[PDB]
Structure formats: C-alpha cells, structure tokens
Paper text:
Recently, the bacterial strain Ideonella sakaiensis 201-F6 was discovered and shown to grow on low-crystallinity PET films. Two α/β-hydrolase fold enzymes (α/β-hydrolases), PETase and MHETase, work together to degrade PET in two steps via MHET, yielding TPA and ethylene glycol—the building blocks required for a new round of PET synthesis. We have determined crystal structures of recombinantly expressed and purified I. sakaiensis MHETase in its ligand-free form (2.05 Å resolution), MHETase bound to a nonhydrolyzable mono-(2-hydroxyethyl) terephthalamide (MHETA, 2.1 Å resolution) or to benzoic acid (BA, 2.2 Å resolution) as well as ligand-free PETase (2.0 Å resolution) (2a−f). PETase and MHETase only share the α/β-hydrolase fold (2.87 Å RMSD for 184 out of 262 residues aligned).
The structure of PETase was solved by molecular replacement (MR) employing the structural coordinates of T. fusca cutinase TfCut2 (PDB entry 4CG111,23). Recent crystal structures of PETase bound to ligands confirmed the predicted α/β-hydrolase fold, elucidated substrate binding, mode of catalysis and even permitted the enhancement of catalytic properties or alteration of substrate specificity. The substrate-binding position of PETase fundamentally differs from that of MHETase as shown for the PETase-1-(2-hydroxyethyl) 4-methyl terephthalate (HEMT) and p-nitrophenol (pNP) co-structures. In particular for PETase, the absence of a lid domain limits the number of residues involved in immediate substrate recognition down to four. Primarily the phenyl moiety of HEMT and also pNP is bound by hydrophobic contacts of Y85, M132, W156 and I179, but the methyl ester or hydroxyl group in the 4-position of HEMT or pNP, respectively, is fully exposed to the bulk solvent. A comparison of the active-site molecular surfaces of LptE, PETase and MHETase in their substrate-bound states illustrates a higher solvent accessibility of LptE and PETase, which is partially related to the induced-fit mechanism observed for MHETase and the number of residues contacting the respective substrate.
Residue numbers in the entry: 29 to 290
Amino acid sequence: TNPYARGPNPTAASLEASAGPFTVRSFTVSRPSGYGAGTVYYPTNAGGTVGAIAIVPGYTARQSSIKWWGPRLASHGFVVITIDTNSTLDQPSSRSSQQMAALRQVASLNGTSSSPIYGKVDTARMGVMGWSMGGGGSLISAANNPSLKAAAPQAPWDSSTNFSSVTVPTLIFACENDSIAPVNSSALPIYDSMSRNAKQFLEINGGSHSCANSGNSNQALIGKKGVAWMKRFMDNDTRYSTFACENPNSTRVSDFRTANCS
Ligand SMILES: [Cl-]
C-alpha cells in the first residue's frame, strides 16, 4: 500500500547504528549553482525513488560540521546534499536561498543522464536541516516553501524567533548549555511559536553549541531521531510513528516536548 516505504521494518537497534540498510556513495557537485560548494550522498539500492534533504552549516563553518548526516540519512534511503555557502559570513536568509538553490540543483541532476543520481530522487519530496544560522535558514525555507515535507534544524540561530506560519513538520534539536544560541532566547521561543504543525523539541543534556555536529557523543539518539522524523514525514511511513513522536525517556535528554505527533 505505502509507495514511499523503503527498507525493512525499523528497530531501535537498526536506527541507533551508524549505518542503515542501504549502500552509500558520494560525489562533489561539479558546477554548484546558487551556493558555494556541495557534496551529495545517495543510496545505490533503495528499491525506488527517495526524497532529498539539503543541509547547511553555521557562520564561519563548513560541510565538515554537518557531514555525518550525509552517510547516516542516505544509508536509510535519502539523497543528502551538504553545502558550503557563497560566503562564510552569510546570514540566515541568504543561507535559506542557498539551501533551496541546492535542492533546485539536486532536482536538475535527477534529470541528467550522466549524473550518479539520475532517476533516484522524488523531486516532490524534500526537506531541510542545518546547524545554527543554517538552522535558522532551515526554518526560513520551511516558512517560504510549505511544500517541504520535513525540517529538522539543530541549535538554531535567528534574531527573529516567530515561525508561527510554518506548517511543515519540524524537529528542533537544542543543546542544553548552548551559549552561542542559548535555548531560552533561540530554540525554545522558536518551538513555542509554531501552532500549525507537527513539531518536537529535543534538548541534549549538558550539550554545548556543537552537540549535534560530526563527532558528537550522542549519535545513537540524535541520528535515530533525525532518521525517524524524515522517514515519518518525508515518506509518510507510519512504521516510524513511534520512533518519531515518542519521548526517549532518556537521561541523555534534559527537555522533551512534542505536539500533534501520534
Ligand atoms: Cl551561527
């Protein structure tokens, strides 16, 4: 019945592991269009077309800070593009237009017969992630493009916290002890402003600003949650409803909140 379903039935163990069931390859985008540089990750054998997720780093940062998501998400059946921005000093709106430019270019490559992702993408099924200003950028993309199927920003930064217009299912990773984008004035008012969506707030206990980046010590839970959220909302895959909406009931989590998520 569900045509966007990919992969075998999830367990806690299969989502806590570093790799999911599909084989991953990557390539560097040859002529990046509307953004500085891109790396694309893709499953060779997903058994059908999959959605595309475009991930953006923070101010002064690079792909390295958010790369781990590439292998992790692609292995469970997604096309992931991680980007560098035109300038290290771009603010969240510019990060947004470049995030959407990356999705636009993944859609183009899906149509190009010489491209390693020829025919692998469902260009009607995309989502957005990013760290800090790239997180703020992810929220701006979702507000501007309600056709996105999912957002999952981490440690988000935006001097405007009102996202009340967002209808896209949104998972916010927060970092308890963030002193760059403190939760009390960033993540939390952002979460709290959204009244029209499936949403979730998941605060990493004793986490600093970088608590969700490559090399974090909570990859099991952060990665499980990130994959379950994209599987639930980008694939409509109700096999993942429990993993996506449940409280982890974990001492690794200092604050949990969810709404409109069964
Ligand atoms: Cl930032």
